[PDB]
């Protein structure tokens, strides 16, 4: 038997990504936020629209998806699609053609603790 | 059909396209990636853009996808959706204004003994240095940095099928001549 | 129709259609 | 099901060099997850080299360095190893073990090879020379088979005939490179005197067929 | 006639499209018959890579196919053959062209 | 990092802003702002026009 | 956080999202309609077009999705795909 599965069906079986992860609805999350630039395309003067290729990283805490390697068998990451956790959701709100989220979902990194890391790329064409 | 419709009712049974195909956590995923080049659409000097239509063939063997021909039939191999099937995530690392990933979820071939191989067709747009100083009797190096976005080596390894692209279904160009290609 | 219905629950009654078309296995 | 099939088994001279195959069917195999593991003759198992996912390159032991080279093809799901200045010391059965998806840091081998017997001699196609045990109540008499090369040989006793109690002991390889074996049985010492006993030897590579009456 | 996605479909694409797209523009229906022929006529908007012969432009003439075949199955699994019902040509209706 | 054909980035700091936080603007809000300031290689425009 | 998962479950066990959402058929949903113009991005002489950015505000009331903030830990907003 996989471990990862073991750990997969352990974190999630009984798990709601809707809801924040905060045992208080008056917590807040914290979210480390790093953008990364990968390329500059362009600057439409006529659209007065930047292009650029970048990467976000955003790192936060879940305590519903904490565990200990020494449990699952010494795994230390787990990848599992996006879609399954929680999100903060975050989008670029001075974007000029309509699109506020990332080009590509990537998986999310689930380390041991309940700290979750999602790196996604995105393509941006924002107002300038 | 009974015999391969009985099949794919069994492998999917109880199948996760969540965790690695492995059967220990422990074992390495072997990825034998080789791009071949269908057509060179597009070099944009001004954005720095090369535009490519490539086939990105991907090989690697999936331990919960296994049978025994003789229990079905004699079916020794199927074609399924690969949206239902663990995949490795392919990134274009220096992806400039195209898709980053593979968006065109064709068919994967599926061996009774686990093997995989997985041909979707993309769109590269790749972002490369054009140097203009010589034009038109200029020569451009332009690459496509390919890996697994959110696994690492120690989880995934990569390997390429061939120490060259394959050239072999490549449509001639009527402004560019390809004098060199290889893979590292 | 109904007659139409109740053919098409006969007909798509462990019906795949992922899966060829193949009575026997090297059927074309 | 997975089988491992290895080349045939070679005979070779020192300073030479063999390679050795293991082709892979039922299943399939990719660059790493290769270890060969030799076995000399009564002897241990003793690990020679592989290619592990964390050095992505064979490693080998100390006392192969220089020597050996090791080399996985997934594309035709077959391994090879070629060790190059053979020694007779290299004489030993080669195994491959292989994994069909290989642990990063280590190995297992859940699949085997029938092995195969690389035998490092400078001695010639040779037969044996053919001497009694003379019996001096059970009495034990036997043939010695002595400085014949290579091997195998068969010994029966009376055509086949006599079984019970018969007992072939596996061949020693003396100094000279030349294997040396016994074929004994134990009898009744009332029959030494009423009962024919002749061993029958035979050594396919020099046609030698020899039938040696033993009495006392 | 039945939904085409609720049926077997042979994988049959435009191999050599130049903008990307290899599929039909609308899926459609499916007519199949109680024999179990199935005919199936999909719409089809397709940019194909066609390379120019340029030396008499404007006073040309052009070569433009448009490859069609399985993008999964093997010659062993789906074979293919010209449609008709000796026609060897592509069909266009006098009326409505 | 490859360098833009035609811009050139010089600098690009971030800040992390938080406004509406008043009884009367109600719950408050917060997000980034990277402010990329980018300089124009003006050759062509030179050599050309 | 196990609150808000309960409460949405209790919400959505019989839910219908294409009837109006009201106690009474007779009854009428007030919806309250705020454009907020975030960007004029061109406008077309030639086709006689004006493109802009906009947020649509749309307030209203839905009957069925109510609950008592005391039996849910003391929840009193959630959000919910729409
Ligand atoms: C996760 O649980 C362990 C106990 O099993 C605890 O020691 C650790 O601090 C927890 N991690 C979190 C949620 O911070």
């Known amino acids: 038997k996989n471990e990862e599965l073991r750990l997969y069906h352990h974190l999630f079986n009984n798990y709601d990504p809707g809801s924040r992860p905060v045992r208080e609805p008056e917590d807040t999350v914290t979210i480390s936020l790093k953008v990364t630039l990968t390329n500059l395309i362009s600057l439409n003067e006529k659209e007065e629209t930047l292009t650029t290729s970048v990467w976000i990283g955003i790192d936060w805490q879940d305590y519903r998806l904490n565990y200990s390697k020494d449990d699952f068998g010494g795994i230390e990451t787990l990848r599992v699609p996006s879609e399954l956790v929680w999100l903060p959701e975050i989008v670029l709100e001075n974007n000029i053609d309509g699109q506020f989220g990332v080009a590509y979902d990537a998986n999310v990194l689930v380390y041991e603790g309940g700290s979750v890391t999602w790196l996604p790329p995105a393509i941006y064409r924002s107002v300038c | 059909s009974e015999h391969e419709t009985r099949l794919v009712a069994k492998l999917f049974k109880d199948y996760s396209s969540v965790v690695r195909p492995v059967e220990d956590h422990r074992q390495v995923v072997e990825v034998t990636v080789g791009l071949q080049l269908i057509q060179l659409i597009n070099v944009d000097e001004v954005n720095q853009i090369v535009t490519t239509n490539v086939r990105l063939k991907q090989q690697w063997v999936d331990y919960n996808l296994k049978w025994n021909p003789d229990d079905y039939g004699g079916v020794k191999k199927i074609h399924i959706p690969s949206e239902k099937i663990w995949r490795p995530d392919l990134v274009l690392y220096n992806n400039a204004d195209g898709d980053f990933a593979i968006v065109k979820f064709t068919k994967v071939l599926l061996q009774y003994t686990g093997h995989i191989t997985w041909t979707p067709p993309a769109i590269f747009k790749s972002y490369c240095e054009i140097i203009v100083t010589h034009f038109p009797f200029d020569e451009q190096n332009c690459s496509m940095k390919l890996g697994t976005w959110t696994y690492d080596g120690s989880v995934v390894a990569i390997n390429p099928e061939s120490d060259q692209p394959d050239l072999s279904n490549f449509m001639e160009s009527g402004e560019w001549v390809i004098k060199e290609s290889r893979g590292w | 129709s109904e007659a139409e219905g109740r053919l098409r629950e006969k007909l798509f009654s462990g019906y795949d259609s992922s899966v060829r078309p193949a009575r026997e296995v090297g059927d074309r | 099901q997975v089988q491992l099939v290895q080349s045939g088994a070679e005979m070779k001279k020192p300073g030479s060099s063999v390679k050795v195959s293991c082709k892979a069917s039922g299943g399939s195999f990719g660059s790493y997850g290769i270890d060969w593991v030799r076995q000399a003759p009564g002897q241990g198992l003793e690990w020679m080299g592989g290619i592990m996912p964390k050095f992505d390159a064979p490693k080998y032991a100390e006392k192969f360095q220089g020597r050996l080279t090791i080399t996985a093809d997934r594309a035709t799901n077959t391994a090879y190893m070629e060790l190059s200045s053979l020694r007779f010391e290299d004489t030993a059965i080669y195994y491959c073990?292989?994994?069909?998806?290989?642990?990063?840091?280590?190995?297992?081998?859940?699949?085997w090879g029938q092995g195969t017997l690389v035998t490092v001699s400078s001695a010639s196609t040779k037969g044996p020379s053919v001497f009694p045990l003379a019996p001096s109540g059970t009495a034990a008499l036997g043939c010695l088979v002595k400085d014949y090369f290579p091997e195998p040989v068969t010994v029966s006793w009376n055509s086949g005939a006599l079984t019970s109690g018969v007992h072939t002991f596996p061949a020693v390889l003396q100094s000279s490179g030349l294997y040396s074996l016994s074929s004994v049985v134990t009898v009744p010492s009332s029959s030494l005197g009423t009962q024919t006993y002749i061993c029958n030897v035979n050594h396919k590579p020099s046609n030698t067929k020899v039938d040696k009456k033993v009495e006392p | 006639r039945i939904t085409a996605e609720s049926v077997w479909l042979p994988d049959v694409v435009l191999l050599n499209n130049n903008d990307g797209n290899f599929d039909v523009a609308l899926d459609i229906s499916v007519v199949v018959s109680s024999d179990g022929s199935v005919r199936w006529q999909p719409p089809g908007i397709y940019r194909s890579s066609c390379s120019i012969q340029v030396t008499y432009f404007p006073f040309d003439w052009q070569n433009c196919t448009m490859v069609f075949s399985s993008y999964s199955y093997d010659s062993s699994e789906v074979s293919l053959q010209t449609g008709l019902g000796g026609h060897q040509e592509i069909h266009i209706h006098e009326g409505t062209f | 990092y490859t360098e833009n054909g035609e811009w050139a980035i010089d600098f690009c700091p971030g800040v992390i802003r938080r406004h509406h936080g008043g009884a009367t603007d109600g719950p408050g809000e917060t997000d980034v702002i990277y402010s990329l300031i980018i300089r124009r290689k003006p050759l062509f425009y030179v050599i050309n026009i | 956080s196990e609150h808000e998962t309960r409460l949405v479950a209790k919400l959505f066990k019989d839910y219908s999202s294409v009837v109006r959402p009201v106690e009474d058929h007779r009854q009428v949903v007030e919806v309250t309609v705020g454009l907020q113009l975030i960007q004029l991005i061109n406008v077309d002489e030639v086709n006689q077009i004006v493109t802009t950015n906009v947020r649509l505000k749309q307030q209203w009331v839905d009957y069925n999705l109510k609950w008592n903030p005391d039996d849910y830990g003391g929840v009193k907003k959630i959000h919910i795909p729409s």
């Open positions: 073990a292989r994994d069909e998806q290989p642990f990063y840091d280590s190995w297992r081998g859940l699949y």
